[PDB]
Amino acid sequence: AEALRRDVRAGLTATQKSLPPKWFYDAVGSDLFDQITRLPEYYPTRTEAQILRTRSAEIISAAGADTLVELGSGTSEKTRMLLDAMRDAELLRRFIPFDVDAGVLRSAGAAIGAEYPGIEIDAVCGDFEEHLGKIPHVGRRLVVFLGSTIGNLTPAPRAEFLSTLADTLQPGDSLLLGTDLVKDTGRLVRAYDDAAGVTAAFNRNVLAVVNRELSADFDLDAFEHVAKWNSDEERIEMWLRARTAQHVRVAALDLEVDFAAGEEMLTEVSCKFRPENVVAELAEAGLRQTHWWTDPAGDFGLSLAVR
Ligand SMILES: Nc1ncnc2c1ncn2[C@@H]1O[C@H](CSCC[C@H](N)C(=O)O)[C@@H](O)[C@H]1O
Ligand SMILES: CN(C)[C@@H](Cc1c[nH]cn1)C(=O)O
Ligand SMILES: [Cl-]
Numbered sequence: 001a002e003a004l005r006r007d008v009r010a011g012l013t014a015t016q017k018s019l020p021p022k023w024f025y026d027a028v029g030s031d032l033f034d035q036i037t038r039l040p041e042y043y044p045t046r047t048e049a050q051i052l053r054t055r056s057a058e059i060i061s062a063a064g065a066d067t068l069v070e071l072g073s074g075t076s077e078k079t080r081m082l083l084d085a086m087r088d089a090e091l092l093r094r095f096i097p098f099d100v101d102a103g104v105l106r107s108a109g110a111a112i113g114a115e116y117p118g119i120e121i122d123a124v125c126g127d128f129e130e131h132l133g134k135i136p137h138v139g140r141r142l143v144v145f146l147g148s149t150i151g152n153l154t155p156a157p158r159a160e161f162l163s164t165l166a167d168t169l170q171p172g173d174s175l176l177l178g179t180d181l182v183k184d185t186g187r188l189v190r191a192y193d194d195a196a197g198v199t200a201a202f203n204r205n206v207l208a209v210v211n212r213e214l215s216a217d218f219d220l221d222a223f224e225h226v227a228k229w230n231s232d233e234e235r236i237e238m239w240l241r242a243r244t245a246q247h248v249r250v251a252a253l254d255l256e257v258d259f260a261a262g263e264e265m266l267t268e269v270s271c272k273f274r275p276e277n278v279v280a281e282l283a284e285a286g287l288r289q290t291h292w293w294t295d296p297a298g299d300f301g302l303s304l305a306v307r
């Protein structure tokens, strides 16, 4: 609660307004993201799923893990391919989902616990930039971070995250990391600006979160969804653009802020990767990439790495 107060105050009073994307993921937002994963324009989920379908047995063989830790786990739908391979290999003992959204952990924990009789479920609620120490150091761990969620951190915080995560890995542990790759810029923008309007609803939902949690009065349909490709930084950006001037009261903060007509507020970055740079970022964090896989079109990459 304090985290949200501080993030919203800092974000809305900055000259370039912004909100952190972790706050998209309340119950409504997590469900909207689940819908995003099945949009025709949003290739990341099905392409990473393709790689996992092909490579899960190999990944499990390489890792030899009895414990799957998943960061930003969400519904853990793709994760079931890894869990199935761990069960086939007679290795699976434990699943540790980690997420900021307590609801999605309760749902996924319940489902996975039932689908895999005899495995321990130990859900951890937290922010993966601050609370990795809540994850138990137990067993032989395959730590999984799918979806290119690592791209939702800009380069300095990403490097700090990776180094911190690397320092939690013991010998015998492995990191499986999904990274979305640089590609045609039209395909990229459309993946964040679908015909169905679902991404736009997901984006505007951060305003609903602030409205509810902090007693604010954002008018959601006064804000236009804008997805941009930033070619200098090689990242997708999501923005909310005020269609007309807006006066917003955030009552829990005793705060009033103004949006000019046309004023844009940054709600998310999604950094896109060049394959050879993924090796370098891992190495910088003290991790040796041991395997690299891509889908048949080269849209998406999956790394396995160790200390
Ligand atoms: N800072 C943060 N700390 C912990 N979880 C976060 C987070 N920011 C986002 N999340 C969670 O990470 C997930 C991002 S969406 C990705 C979901 C799923 N792993 C997939 O690959 O499809 C959501 O479940 C969201 O609630
Ligand atoms: C979760 N993260 C990987 C998504 C979040 C997202 C999807 N659409 C808009 N934002 C992405 O950056 O593609
Ligand atoms: Cl819009």
Ligand SMILES: [Mg+2]
Binding pocket: none
């Ligand atoms: Mg059996």
Ligand SMILES: [Mg+2]
Binding pocket: 219, 222
């Ligand atoms: Mg209005």
Ligand SMILES: [Mg+2]
Binding pocket: 219, 220, 221, 222
């Ligand atoms: Mg309205």
Ligand SMILES: [Mg+2]
Binding pocket: 225
């Ligand atoms: Mg538009």
